[PDB]
Amino acid sequence: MDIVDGDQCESNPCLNGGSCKDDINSYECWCPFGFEGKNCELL
Ligand SMILES: *[C@@H]1O[C@H](CO)[C@@H](O)[C@H](O[C@H]2OC[C@@H](O)[C@H](O[C@H]3OC[C@@H](O)[C@H](O)[C@H]3O)[C@H]2O)[C@H]1O
Ligand SMILES: [Ca+2]
Ligand SMILES: [Ca+2]
Numbered sequence: 001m002d003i004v005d006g007d008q009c010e011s012n013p014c015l016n017g018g019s020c021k022d023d024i025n026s027y028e029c030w031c032p033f034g035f036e037g038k039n040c041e042l043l
Pocket of ligand 3: 016
């Protein structure tokens with residue numbers, strides 16, 4: 001039996017060609033050129 005934090009990136013929360021890196025109980029988005037915001041939502 002194990003405890004797993006889970007992959008919070010499996011829902012693809014990073015938008016607009018952004019890249020998702022899983023973290024602990026969270027994720028970070030690496031945004032492409034021309035996009036910003038926590039989910040790369042902002043032009
Ligand atoms: C999968 O996709 C949905 C929308 O399509 C996201 O909202 C889900 O992320 C949510 O659920 C898991 C939480 O870990 C996540 O919030 C944490 O990670 C991002 C940080 O910006 C935030 O401060 C932190 O609480 C939440 O956004 C995603 O799993
Ligand atoms: Ca995780
Ligand atoms: Ca889009």
